[PDB]
Amino acid sequence: YSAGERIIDIIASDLQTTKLQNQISKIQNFRVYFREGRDQQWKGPATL
Amino acid sequence: GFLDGIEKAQEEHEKYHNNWRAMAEDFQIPQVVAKEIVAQCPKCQVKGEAMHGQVDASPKTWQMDCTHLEGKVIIVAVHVASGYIEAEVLPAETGKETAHFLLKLAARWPVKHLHTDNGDNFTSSAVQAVCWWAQIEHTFGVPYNPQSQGVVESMNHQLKTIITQIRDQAEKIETAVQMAVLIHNFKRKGGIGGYSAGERIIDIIASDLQTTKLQNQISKIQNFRVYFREGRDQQWKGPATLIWKGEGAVVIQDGQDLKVVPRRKCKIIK
Amino acid sequence: IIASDLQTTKLQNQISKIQNFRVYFREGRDQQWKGPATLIWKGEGAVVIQDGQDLKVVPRRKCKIIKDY
Amino acid sequence: FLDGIEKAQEEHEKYHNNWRAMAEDFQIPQVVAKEIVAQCPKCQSPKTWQMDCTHLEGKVIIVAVHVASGYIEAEVLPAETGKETAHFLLKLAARWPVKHLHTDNGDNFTSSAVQAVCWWAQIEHTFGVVESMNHQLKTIITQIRDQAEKIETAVQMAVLIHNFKRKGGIGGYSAGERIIDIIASDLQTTKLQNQISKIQNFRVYFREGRDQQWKGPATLIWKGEGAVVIQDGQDLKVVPRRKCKIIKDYGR
Amino acid sequence: GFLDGIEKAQEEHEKYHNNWRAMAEDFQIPQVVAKEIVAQCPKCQVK
DNA sequence: GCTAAGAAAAATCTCTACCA
DNA sequence: AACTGGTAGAGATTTTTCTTAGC
DNA sequence: GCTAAGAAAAATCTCTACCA
DNA sequence: AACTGGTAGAGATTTTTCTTAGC
Ligand SMILES: O=C(NCc1c(F)cc(F)cc1F)c1cn2c(c(O)c1=O)C(=O)N1[C@H]3CC[C@H](C3)O[C@@H]1C2
Ligand SMILES: [Cl-]
Ligand SMILES: [Mg+2]
Ligand SMILES: [Mg+2]
Ligand SMILES: [Zn+2]
Ligand SMILES: [Zn+2]
Ligand SMILES: [Zn+2]
To answer: Could you tell me if B224 lies within 8 Å of chain D, comparing CB atoms?
Structure first.
């Protein structure tokens, strides 16, 4: 590989690590209203 | 004993059609035998099992119906997960106008699944051609069962009450229909999030897109394969993708199926 | 020869007691109760039944399923 | 907490960040970050539409465009009077939140029917994007013309291809994804502003360390389970709940 | 239905004097009616 | 200065008619 | 073999919030 | 001889359609 | 100022009864 391919690969890998730790919390900040068996009311806000 | 009582109970039910408590008390037979005597009769068995089902409420499902008001034909479509309404007045109840209404709806919003009854305008070649071109899956209800399309008939009721509330502010019926659609979509609040129907459809579609992009970025940098032991026989199943590890159980994906397995029956491999 | 006959009768006994149900259902515009039929599939909310070599979908609120003891 | 608030104030003093970025990075609540942006002197549209009429094959096509995203709603009118224009405007206002309308000085746009619809639906009308969108839509209409029989079918098929099949711009999105993202961001801002005003109708008397006298009336910003963020003397600071007394303020 | 099984189990016990668990498993009738078929026979005794 | 009684105001729960 | 009742308002009961009397 | 597991059988609870 | 929904059956869940293996 040349120099530009190496610098792009290295900084992209570092970004992927740190943003992984932030992105999991971002996906767990949503709220789900679900329905169980043979009860017709929507249950409260569980976490996705 | 009661064996002659069983024969007498069969003759008595053949004449009078007793229920099981009458036969079990008059002939002194046990209740399992009397329940069998009633259950082997065809003139009885006229009663259902007393439950209700639940309809499909995916974030791209729409239901549709036609209603009548003052000699006109209104056609109503509802987004099921939010309660969002589109409605129009048709010159006739043919299949050409229903196909044009469905094409305008698909040009405005993302439609992937349509649910209707078995009316003549919905079981039509024009509607079938539009669904083929726009890639919509059309499903029909069980015939003469309006509970299959419960959301759009509930919205027929709500639309008619708003139209009688604001009727003396318009001249024609078509103006009153569009004013009722505006009042329902933006001026009435309460429900899941304290929202109106317009705020709820914006929240549902935006959260759908954002959560797919987030878990694409999460899953493209994963590791940690998981070997787990489940089944009626204590076997070993193949390569599973670890998704989340919690204090008590783990979440694995195997064959695009999500499973929650406790921590004793699994091992994580880097 | 005799042992294979015993094992075959045992497996056929289990298969005969799995899914031999009768269904009395209610359908049509004038919803009358119609005769017995054979249960094919049972989901939550609706069933698929075979009646007179015709397939029908009935909701579970308009049908009664009779088992065997 | 207070370390995060001081770091966010220093970072905003250098680079003037926005409140969503500061709330995500320095791990503080969103009302505190919005207050940090609101105290800066150097830091102080999702509902505007444009309408136009055009001609094609002897028919009148009326096009409305959402300006911040490029989203299109079109129709085929039987004539070019003001009653059909008023009915098209009433349908658009029934389906989307419309607050500001921009048109040219045509005849049917300057009419009593359009004026009555704008009065009832509370729209601000201004007389003077749509031409570029008309040209792009007409290239699509001549591209997919032989798949349909009438002109209304071809118009609605071109609206679907424009809204959901052509992708571009910065991130590579269609117009429908951009309009839903824009309106959702505005909805988030208005809900947070309602919470901010409801919280800021209070007032706080606090007791500083190694003093037995209560201090001045500081305005409440955030109230937690064990911490309280107050504004006093153009300064933000964090006082625990055991040295605070929160009272209603009537200072309208 | 097991009422025809009740009639066939009565004929079978009149011939061979089966026990009640055997008749209940072979003819698919409940256990109360099988014990009653044994109990009405003068030569037999349910045990 | 601190607590608590008492009332106002908001939140949650159960149940009904209507949709050809 | 691959389908299905739901929505919104009227009271009733319980919980949270706000002011003031008393030690 | 006495206990208890396990299954059969009976009793109680919730919910549905129909009555112009 | 003096009126008004109810009945009966289908499953589901819980409790009582009966036989037999084991110490
Ligand atoms: O009885 C209806 N509603 C009332 C009602 C409800 F809404 C929901 C309930 F849980 C209970 C209800 F009693 C009703 C009936 N039909 C049709 C409707 O749309 C409809 O709403 C319809 O379109 N068709 C077409 C398809 C074949 C032909 C024309 O007969 C049917 C009849
Ligand atoms: Cl139907
Ligand atoms: Mg219909
Ligand atoms: Mg209907
Ligand atoms: Zn009978
Ligand atoms: Zn600034
Ligand atoms: Zn005998």
So the answer is: no
Same domain, yes or no: B143 and B252 = no
Deposited resolution, Å? 2.8
Instruction: State which residue of chain C sits closest to E3, comparing Cα positions.
Output: C69
* C28 C-alpha to ligand 2 centroid (Å): 10
Bridge partners of residue D236, in order along the sequence = D231
- Torsion angle defined by CA atoms of residues D117, D121, D126 and D130, in that order, rounded to the nearest 10 degrees: -90
- CA-to-CA distance for B132 and B134, rounded, in angstroms? 6
Q: Is C19 exposed, middle or buried (0-12, 13-18, 19+ CB in 10 A)?
A: exposed
Question: How do B84-90 and B72-79 pair as beta strands?
Answer: antiparallel
Residue B147 Cα, ligand 4 centroid: separation in angstroms?
9
CATH of residue C24's domain is 2.30.30.10
In which domain, by residue range, is D102 found?
Answer: 48-181
The enclosing domain of D152 has a CATH number of 3.30.420.10
Task: Find the CATH number of the domain harbouring E39.
Answer: 1.10.10.200
**Would you call B198 an interface residue with chain D, using a CB distance cutoff of 8 Å?**
yes
For residue B149, the 8-state DSSP code is: T
Residue C8 within any structural domain of the chain: no
The total number of structural domains that make up chain C: 1
Task: Mark D170-195 as b/e (b = at least 16 C-beta within 10 Å).
Answer: eeeebbbbbbbbbbbeebeeeeeeee
Dihedral, CA of residue D166, residue D170, residue D172 and residue D176, to nearest 10: -60
Starting from the CA of residue B146, give the closest ligand: 1
* Residue C41 in domain: yes
Phi then psi dihedrals of residue C42, to 5 deg: -130, 105
Cα angle, residue D36 at apex, residues D33 and D38 outer, rounded to 5°? 110
Q: Show the tokens assigned to D140.
A: 């699509």
Please answer yes or no on whether B214 and A23 come within 8 Å at the CB atom: yes
CB B240 within 8 A of CB B253: yes
**CA B161 to C1' G18, whole Å:** 40
CA–CA dist D93, D116 (Å, integer): 13
Give the distance from residue B147's alpha carbon to the nearest chain D alpha carbon, in angstroms: 27
Neighbours of chain B (3+ CB pairs under 8 A): A, C, D, E
CA distance D179 to B24: 71
CA nearest to A20 within chain B: B218
Experiment used for this model: cryo-EM
SS3 of residue C51 by DSSP = coil
Q: What is the DSSP letter of B142?
A: P
Between CA D143 and CA D136 the distance in angstroms is 11
